[PDB]
Paper text:
We obtained His6-[name].Mn crystal structures in complex with the near isosteric 2OG analogue N-oxalylglycine (IC50 0.3 μM, as shown by a solid-phase extraction coupled to MS assays using DRG1 (aa 16–40) peptide substrate), N-oxalyl-D-alanine (IC50 4.14 μM), N-oxalyl-D-phenylalanine, and pyridine-2,4-dicarboxylate (2,4-[name], IC50 1.34 μM). Comparison of the [name] crystal structures reveals a flexible region (aa 123–138) located N-terminal to the DSBH β-strands, which normally forms a loop around the [name] active site and is likely involved in induced-fit during substrate binding. Compared to that observed in the [name].Mn.
Like hsJMJD7, [name] forms a homodimer with each 316-amino-acid monomer possessing an N-terminal helix-loop-helix-fold domain (aa 1–42) that forms part of the dimerization interface, a core distorted double-stranded β-helix (DSBH, aa 160–294) fold comprising of eight parallel β-strands and an α-helical C-terminal domain (aa 296–310) which is also involved in dimerization. Notably, the crystallographic analyses on [name] combined with previously reported crystal structures for hsJMJD720 reveal the unusual dimerization mode of [name], which involves interactions between the N- and C-terminal regions of both [name] monomers and is likely conserved in all animals making [name].
Numbering used by the authors:
A (entry chain B): 0 to 129, 134 to 312
B (entry chain A): 1 to 312
Write the structure that this text describes.
């Protein structure tokens, strides 16, 4: 038999199984109305993927070469890793850390050159925007009103991504509503619903950052507080691509959803959904992050965090 | 405190600090379907809209006009001695959950009994879609299309439409319904006390023998316990507290609860979201109608079932 907290958790999971909560990513051929989106997806905290939804100029024009021609081969901020796991788990001297990317700057064409070398380190570009007007002129952001009218606030962030196939984003959650638009290539998402939290292994790890030495080899440097001892972070311990079900029995009761998002597709990723992200080589994407509007679901989720701490 | 009580403390802290289910929103104008979906339905948040309806009914529906328009036909009426149909009452040392005495009588007969201050409490409260079922001719004095602003968020027709006409002594004890509720007062006013689902742990609940009101040959009311052949009580889980006069010594947990009071006048619309606890009083001969819609399941319902397991 099981504990009191575990009886409560089991009731949650059984009720959500019977009702098939978060059991499928809805597939749409056409952009829904603002009301359809509010009713069927936003208010139900439910992912949706809209196929061939966008006809943006970008979708054709945008490549690394065209971006170099357009942006004037500017200097950008790029994240670098030895293993391709920025914000991810890595071992050193037998200790598993949560490591942050080595963040540096370089010329866009140099980034492109370093993307074509399989032998080198893994690079990805994540630009946190709000030349740049020229780039914004290749996008019809109004096409996303159907979703924005549900959130009733402007994008709190608009990110541009250009990255290596080797760049894998490990499973994590975000306090945002997320509208994701692939421009070039395809992005693979693995999604787990919030309420399955108790089936997702999480641990506490010393946090570090990747650094190069004089010789150019990578190591992990522990991160430390204002003055004194180490810093920690809580992070998903399981690998969705190859779950070790022996080490993590409970993960077998989870139900991950797999969705591939192609150029011209839209993916609504609701707030606090677990996701793991892969992509094709030199995939380009832009996504819009909206601050969430707190409802009782968030409070239940905080409670669930407390129960499964 | 235990792990479960710690988790419940988290739930209540976050909800209180984020102003979740913390008030009834007043509007003077009917929202748009999108506004209603975003601000009230998707948030499971109650809202009252003042002077929202201009139905013919709001002018004309009285005891007399209903006696005339319905040809003084016979109707279902719930009767109690204390005014608590489907409520708790004590007898011979035992607290029972009591079902009302249900009978049929002429509409004019009911009106005569509402005019008796000393009589038993009468209430036309059958619900189970008694307006569409038993009173179709009244439907022409309403305009259900005016509720489209909310109906589009439910995306299904009303699964029930109820008609209420009761005594000021007829009080409905606190309970929850598996429905989205659109409440339209026609005459008089209705007083609601509301508590959000996530405060379930602040609401005491008990298992009670079930009974039903009966009269003796002399006309005295009494509770008859409901039992099967074996002599065993059939039980009902019910809210134990009286929102009007809470007994915080008996029920300390109700201290952390925050009831919301709202009076709904003729022409006002109240949206009572699914599984919201509600207690209902009314003015004398208040007339109301309301529309029940089956709820659309999401993870909140699973969390509420977990909350019920956590507090039993
Ligand atoms: O595209 C990504 O690599 C990525 C990484 C982390 N987060 C997100 C997101 O859409 O939230 C996307
Ligand atoms: O108006 C009432 O008396 C009443 C009683 C019980 N329930 C409801 C309801 O609208 O759910 C209304
Ligand atoms: Mn993310
Ligand atoms: Mn009710």
């Amino acid at each position: 038999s099981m504990s009191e907290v575990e009886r409560a958790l089991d009731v949650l999971l059984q009720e959500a199984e019977e009702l098939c909560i978060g059991s499928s990513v809805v597939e749409l051929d056409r952009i829904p109305t603002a009301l359809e989106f509010c009713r069927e997806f936003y208010s139900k905290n439910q992912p949706v993927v809209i196929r061939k939804a966008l006809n943006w100029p970008a979708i054709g024009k945008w490549t690394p070469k065209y971006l170099i021609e357009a942006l004037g081969d500017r200097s950008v901020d790029v994240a670098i890793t030895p293993n391709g796991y920025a914000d991810g788990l890595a071992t050193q001297n037998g200790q598993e850390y949560f490591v942050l990317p080595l963040e540096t700057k370089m010329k866009l064409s140099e980034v492109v050159r370093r993307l074509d070398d399989p032998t080198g380190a893994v690079h990805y570009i994540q630009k946190q925007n709000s030349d740049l007007p020229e780039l914004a002129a290749d996008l019809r952001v109004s096409d996303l009103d159907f979703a924005q009218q549900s959130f009733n606030k402007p994008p709190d962030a608009v990110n541009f991504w250009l990255g290596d196939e080797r760049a894998v984003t490990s499973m994590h959650k975000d306090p945002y509503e997320n509208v994701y638009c692939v421009i070039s290539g395809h992005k693979d998402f693995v999604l787990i619903p919030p309420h399955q939290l108790s089936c997702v292994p999480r641990g506490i790890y010393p946090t570090g950052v990747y650094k190069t030495s004089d010789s150019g080899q990578f190591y992990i440097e522990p991160l430390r507080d204002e003055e004194g001892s180490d810093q920690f972070t809580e992070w998903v311990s399981v690998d969705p691509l190859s779950p070790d079900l022996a080490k993590y029995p409970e993960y077998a009761r989870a139900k991950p959803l797999k969705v591939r998002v192609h150029a011209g597709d839209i993916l609504y990723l609701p707030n606090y959904w677990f996701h793991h992200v892969s992509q094709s080589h030199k995939c380009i994407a832009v996504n819009f992050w909206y601050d969430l509007d707190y409802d009782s679901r968030y409070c239940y989720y905080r409670m669930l965090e407390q129960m499964t701490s």
